[PDB]
């Protein structure tokens, strides 16, 4: 089956044995995390289907926490002397799904 | 009248697609055993062989 989790202000369709981008949580590596808020859990035959269904929690297992690729942010304006230049590395968290 | 722009290196190499020379159109002079240009005589020993020159 599958289930829909809500992690970082947005929703992720995840099934089993699966690795994901999730934005940053507060766990060290090698730990275990639990999603207590699942939305539409069930495949073809298994159904509940509910507004923020209660009872089912989904586990995870953290593989690494690191930073993404550097996204260089440049912005100029013509005929003038204006410019800016930055750089950004959005930190993520990689998981692995163990049970629905 | 003068050029308005600097003609690039893509537009330059295209224009000399058709700028080349062709093969001479040789034969084998059958008495001496050389190459000669056809309908001409041999610069070595050689007959014309329809004329023996």
């Amino acid at each position: 089956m599958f289930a829909i989790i809500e992690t970082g202000g947005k929703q992720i369709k995840v099934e089993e044995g699966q690795e994901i981008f999730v934005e940053k949580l507060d766990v060290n590596e090698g730990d275990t995390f639990t999603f207590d808020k699942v939305l539409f859990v069930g495949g073809d035959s298994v159904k509940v289907g509910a507004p923020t269904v209660e009872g089912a929690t989904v586990t995870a297992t953290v593989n690494k926490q690191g930073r993404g690729k550097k996204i260089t942010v440049f912005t100029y304006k013509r005929r003038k002397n204006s410019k800016r230049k930055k750089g950004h590395r959005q930190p993520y968290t990689k998981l692995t799904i163990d049970k629905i | 009248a003068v050029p308005k722009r600097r003609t690039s290196k893509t537009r330059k190499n295209k224009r000399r697609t058709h700028f080349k020379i062709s093969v001479p159109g040789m034969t084998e002079c059958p008495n001496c055993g050389e190459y000669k240009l056809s309908h001409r005589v041999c610069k070595n020993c050689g007959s014309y062989n329809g004329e023996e020159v």
Binding site: - | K20, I21, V23, P24, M26, E34, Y35, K36, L37
Partner: protein, 111 residues
């Protein structure tokens, strides 16, 4: 196993040479001696006299036969110019670039 014979700073232009070197590339060496002796251009006996040095440095001192040889690559690089002028009308003067060239013939034998 392959030889070469580089002639350098020949008085002729570098774009008029590589029309003739374009014509013989990847061809048998027995023909390419006798193609340069039938074309009526100005850089044919010059290229010919350096092809007959890659065909004598491949038989002498490497000791390979000159019946199987094939022209692998033949390319004309560029050598230094000789800037001379030409007195032109109304007190002006234009620069005339007499260019020179480097010629390299490399023969092979398929091994």
């Amino acid at each position: 196993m392959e030889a070469k014979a580089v002639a350098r700073t020949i008085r002729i232009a570098p774009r008029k040479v590589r029309l003739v070197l374009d014509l013989i590339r990847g061809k048998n060496a027995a023909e390419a001696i006798a193609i340069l002796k039938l074309t009526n251009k100005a850089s044919s006996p010059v290229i010919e006299k350096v092809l007959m040095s890659a065909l004598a440095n491949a038989e002498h001192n490497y000791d390979m036969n000159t019946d199987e040889l094939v022209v692998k690559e033949a390319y004309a690089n560029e050598g230094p110019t000789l800037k001379r002028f030409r007195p032109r009308a109304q007190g002006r003067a234009s620069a005339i670039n007499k260019r020179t060239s480097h010629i390299t013939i490399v023969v092979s034998d398929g091994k």
